[PDB]
Structure 1
């Protein structure tokens, strides 16, 4: 309303800029997003009188914006030379600069403003001055460039010629990296202008063995340019070092052959390039360049690269060996030897991404499934049980998403390890796989995605038994539809049974069972109870996966036995105090379980020495008291024939009483006696 009123200095309606400071407006007010003044914005705009009128009323031409720039320094851009006259007698130093080191003179140069450049020249502008930025852009070797180097790279060949001859400029000045004006010139895409500037620079003495980005020489920048005349112009100078290399060990001539440039290559041999830094007749061969193989005849490397994968090892050693073009950071070969699996689109192949072994999922460049795989992958880099995502690269027609390379599918993994477990033993491996999937899906959901198609083909296991989620091309952002989360939790129900039964029941058999059949298929009570909570997670999913990680399904056998004994040691169970708080949680009001008359179901010998004191009753309390008492003494020397008949006590009590830990868990679940549960 107030100072925003002289938005009118932008409308260039000067009667509204005249009048509305007539009522009072701070011509030096600076909007502080970027610090522009009316007097700044007038010179960028180039107006005789919008400038003169603000000058007319005390607006100072040296106030700086965020960039650090003056109305003088930006007046070097517009190139208007008595806009510079109207504010020349108001400038302390004609070589004032902005925060990045730019003087009025240096910016007449980058914008080709020739009349501006000579007016500032004979009023004391330093043509040779290097740019002085802040120290955080100096400890990375920026700054130090001259006016000459930006007249160079921007192609102002008119502005360049005047600097070397009329203005004394320093041709072989370097910037803080070491580049001279020369390398700036050969980064200009304009072929004509790049040719003219470099001939002007060279004949005044630019060092032609400087280096630039990539450690390339000027000659290597000419070759990668595919430009015949710069290669010959540069070699016309007889101190050129032909066999110099970039950071990657390639000489100019090696690239000359690689990129199928016959005559470019022919002159660098004719001028002393090395015929021995690589296999150069092999490269011209595979480039179908008959005339260049022909001439290269008339005038090896041992190999370490270890793949980390064992299954894919020998296929990836081979792909390291063969020559392939790069698709970005990615080396790939569509061939059946490197094929991992078939997709609806493109399949998945092996790969080398920045020399790391990867799996490559190939999508068509437009495909919706691809864009949906990538976004979800991008929200999951913090999810430790999602396959690591290295990055995408597209060849303009086909998108390659590159992922951490794994060894086996969950289904393959369960097959290869079906025989490692004694029939009569604890399945720790099932708990590990399934707990990783709970976390993986839990984190996926907190990140706002639902997978929508989990099944053992999408679950990956790597060289060290980690399990990973993969294949997110059917995923959805679930915020717009929060009840769709429930399909991930039914699939998890199916997978809990899939893994507990060790792969014996195919996943597709399960996908055709009703919920109630799969529950009956559960082998034990912990498992049936867990699956139930995955099929009925509530209109209240929230984060039901995290709490289930505390289910007794995930308790070891030692932990289960420990909890049963620790409850059994509470004071009121040993004294059989039925009005206690613990006994009223476990057995209030009067059956129907596997441990009613539990005294009946343990063998009569073991029952008799436990009555080395009335006696034990058909109480759940007394059965926990029992477990505690035998727990503390099963190993003592008087009781070796007890120990022999019980077997391992944890297994004994669980298989004789299948529902017991689930019952105790259920009764103590949200009570102080939770403290006896194992740590989660």
Structure 2
């Protein structure tokens, strides 16, 4: 708290207080730990020589380095007051001392366009053609190696560039580690005037014009993309320039000029040997409605690639092949055309259209760029990237006024998918597919809740099936961060219960019908007790922060018919069931209501089968599980083949005859030691 007010005093520029505290013993080489700023560093930055003098009076080191390795000498280059540089030079071991990224005081004078300061340092031994030596991580990615001229050229300081080349013997064709010269730095400056002057200077000194910058672009290409005919003329004056150089994308300087609607620039390029075998220029000019340029390319005319690209979607394959072939302007990384041929579906605002994002096929959901709906969709999607059962999110792109959200393209909606597979199974077979779809949804919605989000509009058109029969949740425009109202999670759970019934009924019942039913009507329409119990627990959940849904994945609804039969057999093999030990812990657990279908169960079984098993079966639950265990073990023997014919497949037998059995046993043993007999879930 003493050095603290020394620091505070220097920023307010209260000079007496600075003297007082140095007299009082305040450390002038105190470095704040976040970024390493010294009071001498901060003094040079604010340009107050009075403060620079008083601190130096009290032994403050002028080559003390902050986090980036900069000394208050190097910071003086940035300030560009020469009398500060005078005051510190007597103490500085090397005038070419650099920071961790290789910046010297002379470079910093070049960067900040400090003419008076760069002269001073020039006379005092500064290296003019110094390249920046940086840390090893940065050099292995070929960063660094820039020079004072490149910095001056990029920031457009014409004053500084002139002096460097003429007065200071600056190398014009010095390169950085990536291979760039000052010419390419010069051509990236937004101001046309300053760019024009600097390129002229650099050219006359012998700056190479066949060099490669970002995107493998040449100087000429950069000048064309800038739309500046002047810089094109200057670079065309050199004859050893390669006019038919191509960037990373395979585009040539002429091609871009035609594409960019630049008549003057196009003609001038042709009249300097630019080949017209780079692309179909007249189609491009025709598309741009430049009649005059079409004529020119035609009057100069004397007399296409191969289409590699293949879509992975088979439903959308032919339309994507078309969209890939046509020309469209890019919206960032997105290629899209708003036409019914490329439309997937209709929405509350904008529609779903096929698109290409980074040349990958996607579904593009459109919103107005201001839309609250568009904001919640993107916010929820960007938190869901680890949720395997949520549709993959590529990215969002905006133009003037439309937010495009790009998503993984799926084959079918849940509804369509159920329709296509509706004739696959015979009427009364076990429905594995309903389990897979629903367990996927439970995980999807459960993970979304752990993410802090609730969907708020779960229905079969928001659920998509990919080429490999995976189920994915989509459409988060009405989603909410559920901490805002934790009780609206129940709406997700209710829609899940309707989706349970919807999928179990193979889509024969519409979702609209099901939403118009009451809870009791939904339970009645359920074909079995497992489904009934599950839907019940979704409408009457417990209380959980996205733990609830994963728990219900252990519910016997998601147990196969073999696993259900296996659990009843395993329970019926407990010692105390076979010995009918009625004080036992197991039988006390199955102790007890509403007349179950297995009360008086020995009467409901075929009398031949009942007779032969007896080799004393009472109407207890314990005795029925023993019955199931025994039959399970001996059903396949030669001795029992008539029994086997009457029973058929045993799992289905007991379940049809006693529909509440599995659920009853599950409820009695669910939080007990005998849970171990349940299938692994």
TM above 0.5, yes or no, is yes
Residues 77, 104 of structure 1: 8 Å contact kept: yes
Alignment of 1:306-455 (within 5 A): 306-455=310-459
Partner residue, 1:597: 600
Deviation by residue 1:447-487 (Cα, 9 ceiling, x = unmatched):
11111110111111111111111110001111121111111
Q: Deviations over 1:245-265 (max 9, x none)?
A: 000100101101100111111
Q: Which residue number in structure 2 is paired with residue 167 of structure 1?
A: 168
Deviations 1:44-79 (A, max 9, x none): 111121111111111111111112111111111111
Query: 2: CA distance between counterparts of 1:626 and 1:440?
Result: 40
Trace 1:61-210 onto structure 2 (pairs within 5 A).
Answer: 61-210=62-211
- Alpha-carbon spacing, 1:173–1:540, altered in 2? closer, same or farther (3 Å): closer
Task: Report how many residues are paired.
Answer: 676
1:598-617 alignment to 2 at 5 Å? 598-612=601-615, 615-617=616-618
Alignment of 1:186-585 (within 5 A): 186-299=187-300, 300-540=304-544, 543-585=547-589
Q: Deviations over 1:268-316 (max 9, x none)?
A: 1111111112111110110101011101112232212111111111111
Shift of 1:539: 4.7
Question: What's the offset of the Cα at 1:2?
Answer: 4.6
Q: Deviations over 1:149-203 (max 9, x none)?
A: 0111111111111111111111111000000011000001110111111111111
Contact residue 3 and residue 26 of structure 1 kept, 8 A = no
Residue 575 of structure 1 and its aligned partner are, at CA, apart by 1.6
SS of residue matched to 2:407: strand
Shift of 1:578: 1.5
Flag the 1:118–1:542 CA change in 2: closer, same or farther, 3 A. Answer: closer
Counterparts of 1:542 and 1:111, CA distance in 2: 55
Q: CA deviation at 1:541?
A: 6.1
Tell me the equivalent position of 1:30: 31
Kindly state the Cα deviation for residue 235 of structure 1 after the two structures are TM-superposed.
1.0
Q: CA deviation at 1:538?
A: 3.1
**Contact 1:3–1:29 at 8 Å: present in 2 too?**
no
Q: For the structure 1 residues 247 and 224, does the alpha-carbon distance in structure 2 shift closer, same or farther, using more than 3 Å as the test?
A: same
Structure 2 CA distance for partners of 1:5 and 1:108, relative to 1, 3 Å: closer
How far does residue 229 in structure 1 lie from its aligned partner after superposition? Answer: 1.0
- Whether the aligned pair in 1 keeps the contact of 2:6 and 2:18 (CA below 8 Å) is no
Asked if the contact 1:391–1:401 (Cα under 8 Å) also holds between the matched residues in 2, the reply is yes
| Displacement of 1:671 | 0.9
Secondary structure of the structure 1 residue equivalent to 2:311: coil
CA distance in 1, matches of 2:545, 2:216: 57
Residue 293 of structure 1 aligns to a residue in which SS? helix
CA positional deviation for 1:540: 4.8
Higher mean C-alpha displacement, 552-561 vs 76-85? 76-85
How far 1:638 moved relative to its partner?
2.2
Q: Secondary structure at the match of 1:403?
A: strand
Listed as ranges, the gaps of 5+ residues in structure 2 are none
Partners of 1:671 and 1:31 in 2: CA distance: 60
Deviation string, structure 1 residues 524-543 (Cα, Å, up to 9, x no partner): 00000000000101355652
Q: Judge conservation of contact 1:6–1:20 (CA < 8 Å) in 2.
A: no
Check 1:155–1:542 CA distance in 2 against 1; reply closer, same or farther (3 A cut).
closer
1:239 CA displacement: 0.5
What is the Cα deviation at residue 3 of structure 1?
3.2
Deviation of the 1:607 alpha carbon: 1.6
Cα separation, 2, equivalents of 1:383 and 1:432: 16
Contact persistence 1:3–1:25 (CA under 8 A)? no
Q: What secondary structure, in the 3-state scheme, does the structure 2 residue paired with 1:327 have?
A: coil
Q: 1:304-342: CA deviations, max 9, x gaps? A: 211111111111111001000000000000001011111
Change (3 A) 1:540 1:236: closer
Pairwise CA RMSD of aligned residues?
1.1
Give the conservation status (yes or no) of the 8 Å contact 1:444–1:450: yes
Q: TM-score, normalised on structure 1?
A: 0.98
Q: Given the superposition, is the C-alpha separation of residues 459 and 298 from structure 1 closer, same or farther in structure 2, using an over 3 Å criterion?
A: same
SS in 2 for 1:601: coil
For 2:56 and 2:284, how far apart are their aligned partners in 1? Answer: 67
The 2-side partners of 1:456 and 1:346 are apart by: 20
Preserved CA contact (<8 Å) 1:493 1:531: yes
Determine if contact 1:106/1:146 at 8 Å carries over to the other structure: yes
SS in 2 for 1:600: coil
Work out the CA distance in 2 between the residues paired with 1:335 and 1:342. 12
> What is the SS of the residue equivalent to 1:437?
helix
Instruction: Give, in whole Å, the separation in 2 of the partners of 1:640 and 1:457.
Output: 49
Distance in 2 separating the partners of 1:540 and 1:397 = 41
Q: Assess if the C-alpha contact under 8 Å between 1:572 and 1:583 holds in 2.
A: yes
Normalised by the length of structure 2, the TM-score is 0.98
Deviation, 1:20, is: 2.5
Deviation at 1:15, TM superposition (A): 1.4
Q: List, as ranges, runs of 4+ consecutive aligned residues in structure 1 with deviation greater than 4 Å.
A: 539-542
Deviation readout 1:576-595 (Å, 9 max, x if unpaired):
2222221221235xx82111
SS at match of 1:468: strand
Deviations 1:373-398 (A, max 9, x none): 11111111111111111100000201
The answer on whether the counterparts of 2:3 and 2:27 sit within 8 Å (CA) in structure 1 is no
Deviations 1:12-44 (A, max 9, x none): 121111222222211111111111111111111
Deviations along 1:417-445, whole A, 9 cap, x unmatched?
11111111100000011111111110010
Higher mean Cα deviation, 658-667 or 533-542?
A: 533-542
Secondary structure in 2 matching 1:242: coil
Cα distance in 2 between the residues matched to 1:421 and 1:548 = 26
Counterpart CA distance in 2 for 1:295 and 1:6 is 69
8 Å contact 1:483–1:539 — kept in the other structure? no
Rounded to whole Å, the distance in 2 between the matches of 1:114 and 1:41 is 22
The verdict on how the C-alpha distance between 1:592 and 1:357 changes in structure 2, with shifts beyond 3 A counting, is same
- Structure 1 gap ranges (5+): none
C-alpha spacing 1:136/1:576, structure 2 compared with 1 (3 Å): same
Moved more, 299-308 or 481-490: 299-308
